[model samples]
Target: TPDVFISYRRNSGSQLASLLKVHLQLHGFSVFIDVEKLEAGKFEDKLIQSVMGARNFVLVLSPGALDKCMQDHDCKDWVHKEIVTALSCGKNIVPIIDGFEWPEPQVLPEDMQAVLTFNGIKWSHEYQEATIEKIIRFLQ
Candidate 1:
């Protein structure tokens, strides 16, 4: 119940990912991120496999992260695979946005619609500590 696989757009949502990594760990949560060399290659196979162990799948939705999968429902991109794998494995999918307010609905493919349905919390620096603990309370 404590494992949290934090997925995000490299270089985009990384700042928040690293931040969550520590905060979650401090609260006794096992978190996963990536190694440098393969993250440079999209870390294909290992990435999806990595999604397996975590019960909480925290996806940091940075701008443009979903652009590809937003249209192509059959997209085989690693990010798509992460979501798909996490879903099939019954992981608690949690999407993290940069602000307190959730975004309005935009056109998304059918398979991806569930992602928007899940309730998520903000990763904003304004309420950083609060948000971190809020997530901890949820997972723990």
Candidate 2:
């Protein structure tokens, strides 16, 4: 099983997720990147398994990452689903806020409010190394 599971939107944070996966691997930590691990098809069960089995869940929240979920009550965005699943399984949910402010808890979906409570790390192209260092410290 991987030590960390990365949850991110394809259009928003996939690049950072890939970078994190490589960095963690170099540091001897197993990382599960869902896009790479899951095949090109519906794999809800597989996604749940990966998130539940990992020791930590990193939610890479970039702009528009949670837009669909926030815009529609009936939306079942995969990122939101992963966050809910991680919370239910009591996994350490780390929010990587990339050059964006954390959303207000009151405005978030009810199921996602808890995400705001977790300590988040800020990352940007300008501060990649420092942010990665903080993440490594948290994982270790």
Candidate 3:
């Protein structure tokens, strides 16, 4: 199985996720981000398949990263959907939070609400490398 599967919003946190991927790879962690850039229909099935294979799930939460899932609520918001998926499998879930403060309980979908309860590593562009080090350290 892949060592790390990073979940990020295409418009918001994709860049940081890419950078983290390189760092993880440099450290000899097999990182998977193949599902980040894609259309809804084409990626639906493979999305879960991809996540299911990974040992760790690094959720990149930049400012307003989850707006699509919160505002629209029409379902299948990829971030929340993937979050829900990762939760179901009881994988190693870690949020690489930038500036998005999670809402109180019940604000998020019932399943996804548990995400904020998990302690996350607060990250910044300023401390990117150190944060990545913590991530890698946590997994080991």
Candidate 4:
């Protein structure tokens, strides 16, 4: 299994995940970015498995991701679900707030807010190596 599972929206956090993946690998972490890893069938099942199996779950939250979560009335945003699964399974759930603003609790759903409140880190830029080191420390 991968050392870290990157949970992000393709249109929003793909680039962030890409940059983080490079640095994470350089630091000797096995990163699992869904867009580049899993393919085709049974995506949901695969996501559940990956999140449960991973040592850390890095969730990249963007404005677009917040909007999408708001629009999701099903009470289960995909990213939110991933975070919950990680927490439930006792995996490290690292919330990465990308961009200038640190998201308020209301910006995220209840489940995500819980983890964010507990242990969340915000990065204005993707390639912040020092910030990445902090995140790595959190996982450790």
Candidate 5:
């Protein structure tokens, strides 16, 4: 029953998100990704609203995302905002850790720590089915 809300970095998670979007749609999901819907400069408010309205938030944890949230000082970053807003909205935030490590509390925002407790779906291209199964199970 989820309109899958995907959060990922353009540098690392783009291809994976694209593939998953098509795959999930074929399997009957209402997938929402900025590339599939948003126009330039119309993203901020729309993204926040859409993500909060979604039933589930799928964060494709990547090096770029971690660095942007934890290292850089941009709170307006979409992925970080989506994760925090999703949690505040009481939506499930499942982090698909794509070969990335959890950052220390000193580097990460307090609310973001809850993501560590949720079970992770690890990936490597070879175990694609395993990743999709975890996603479907979480959605169900």
Candidate 6:
């Protein structure tokens, strides 16, 4: 099982996820990033299994991530489903805020409101080293 499961919006948070995967792996923590790890196919069962087995669930909250998910009524957004699954599984959810303010609970769907309560670490180009350190500290 992986030590950390990374949940992120591909458009906005993929870069950050990639960076974290490298650092986390270097620190001896197995990291699971779906895009990098999963083959191109239907993989919901695999996704759930990975998340449930992981020790930490890191949510990369980049700009517009929550808004985009909330606006999509079709409920087909994988990020949204991943967040809910993590919560349901009682995983150690951590929000890694990047390039945007954390979304308010009222602005999120009822199922996702709990994410607002998770203590998050900020990540930006200006303070990436310090942010990475903070994340490592938390995971370790």
- Candidate 4, run of 10 with poorest lDDT: 66-75
Choose 1 or 6, whichever is better by lDDT.
Answer: 6
lDDT of 5 by residue, 1-140 (tens): 24788888999989888877887787788988888866567678888888877797888886656677774355766677887788888777677777687777677777665766777777668888777876888874
**What TM-score would every model get versus the actual structure?**
0.81, 0.89, 0.88, 0.82, 0.87, 0.89
TM-score of model number 6:
0.89
Q: Write the per-residue lDDT of candidate 1 for residues 92-127, one digit (tens) a residue.
A: 888888732333446656666667787777666778
The residue pairs that clash in candidate 3, if any, are: none
TM-score of 2: 0.89
lDDT tens per residue, model 6, 76-101: 67888888888888888888987777
As for TM-score, the candidate ahead, 1 or 3, is 3
lDDT (Cα atoms) of all candidates against the true structure:
0.73, 0.82, 0.81, 0.77, 0.76, 0.83
Q: Residue-wise lDDT of candidate 2 within 36-75, one digit each (tens)? A: 6776655887888889999899888888787766744553
Model 2 residue runs over 4 Å out of place are: 39-42, 71-75
Q: Is candidate 2 or candidate 6 better by lDDT?
A: 6
Q: Considering lDDT, which of the candidate structures 5 and 6 is the better prediction for this target?
A: 6
Taking the candidates one at a time, how many backbone clashes does each contain?
0, 0, 0, 0, 0, 0
Cα RMSD of predicted structure 2:
1.9
User: Which residue pairs in candidate 2 collide?
Assistant: none
Stretches of candidate 5 off by over 4 Å are 71-74
Model 4 Cα displacement at 108 (Å)? 5.2
